[model samples]
Target: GLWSKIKAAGKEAAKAAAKAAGKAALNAVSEAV
Candidate 1:
């Protein structure tokens, strides 16, 4: 149970990181264009 919770949290963190990176990339492209 603890391991499962940890795994889920890790997945959420990864998703958040990817989302932030995507947003940052959009911001950079917006500035460039």
Candidate 2:
């Protein structure tokens, strides 16, 4: 149970980080253009 909960939380954190990274890349590309 605890392992599953921890894995779920890790997945959520990874998704959030990926979303933030995507936004940052988009902003950088827009500025470069």
Candidate 3:
């Protein structure tokens, strides 16, 4: 249960962070150009 929970949190975080960064980066580039 412990290991499964930790893995789920980490995987969720990775996607969340990546999506956040991706959105910001795209917005910034769009604004700049």
Candidate 4:
């Protein structure tokens, strides 16, 4: 039920730290599953 909940909590940095935040997020859900 909270599968997509992973994304809602990752909208951090707005535009900055994307290199770190975005890159890490690319597979965050994979580990979640």
lDDT of each: 0.83, 0.84, 0.83, 0.69
Can you write out model 4's per-residue Cα lDDT over 1-33, one digit (the tens) per residue?
Answer: 555755644676454575877777978987899
For model 1, the run of ten residues with the poorest summed lDDT: 1-10
Native-referenced Cα lDDT, model 4 = 0.69
The better-scoring model by TM-score among 2 and 3 is 3
Top model by lDDT, which number? 2
Off by over 4 Å in 3: 1-3
Candidate 2 lDDT over 1-33, as tens digits, reads 454547877878888988898999999999999
Clashes of each: 0, 0, 0, 0
Candidate maximizing TM-score: 3
Weakest 10 consecutive residues of candidate 4 by summed lDDT: 6-15
- TM-scores for every candidate against the unseen true structure: 0.58, 0.57, 0.61, 0.29
Question: In candidate 1, which residue ranges exceed 4 Å CA deviation?
Answer: 1-5
For model 3, residues 1-33, the per-residue Cα lDDT tens digits are 454548777878897887888999999999999
TM-score result, candidate 4: 0.29
lDDT score, candidate 1, position 13: 81
